[PDB]
C-alpha cells in the first residue's frame with residue numbers, strides 16, 4: 001500500500017512550477033486541505049509527498065512547463081503526474097497504485113494551505 | 127516555521143535502526159499516533175519527516191547504534207536527534223526551532239502505526 005514503509009511516494013520534476021496536494025476524504029467530517037508547493041529550481045527537483053493521518057484520499061497535480069513523474073519506493077518505474085484536477089494523480093488510502101481521478105468538485109471546499117502542506121522538495125545538500 | 131516550504135524537516139542516520147515519530151496535540155481529541163520506521167541500511171540513510179494536518183506537536187527519536195541528525199531545509203547545520211522519549215526531538219507547530227522535550231507521558235496514549243506514519247527513508251535510486 002502506498003505511503004507504508006517500502007512504498008513511499010516520490011516526485012521528480014523539471015523546471016520551476018507548483019506541486020499542489022489536495023488532502024481529502026477526512027474521517028469524522030474533517031475538512032479537506034489544498035496547498036501548492038512552489039519550486040524555483042531550473043533543473044530536476046526531487047520531492048517526498050506525505051499523507052496526513054485521518055484522511056483517506058490524496059490527489060496531486062503539477063503546474064509547470066516541465067515534466068513531472070512519480071516513483072513508488074525504490075521501484076524503477078517513473079510515470080507522469082497529473083497536470084489538472086480533472087486528471088489528477090490520486091491515491092485512495094490502502095491502494096498500491098496511483099490512479100487518475102477527477103477531483104474538480106472537491107477543490108472548492110478545501111482550506112488553502114499553500115506553502116504549508118505535506119509535500120516537500122528535497123534540497124541540494126541532502 | 128518548520129514544515130513550511132523552505133523549512134522542511136530532513137534526517138540523516140548511519141547504520142540500521144528505527145526512526146520513530148510521535149504525532150500529538152491533535153485537534154479536538156484526535157488520537158495521538160506513534161510509529162517506528164525501520165531501516166536496514168548499513169551506511170547513510172536520508173529521510174523526509176512530515177507533519178499531519180490537525181496535529182500541533184511532533185516528536186521523534188532514533189534508536190540505533192549509529193548517529194542521527196536533523197537538517198532544516200537547505201540549511202547546512204546538522205544537529206543530533208534525540209535518542210529516548212525523555213529527551214525527544216520535538217517541534218511545536220509554528221516554531222522554527224527543534225527543542226528537547228520529555229514526552230514519556232504522551233507515548234502510552236498513542237495509537238501504534240509502525241511502518242505507516244509520516245516519516246520516509248529515501249531510496250537508493252532517487
Ligand SMILES: [K+]
Nearest residue numbers: 036038114115
Ligand atoms: K506561492
Ligand SMILES: [K+]
Nearest residue numbers: 121131132133
Ligand atoms: K524549498
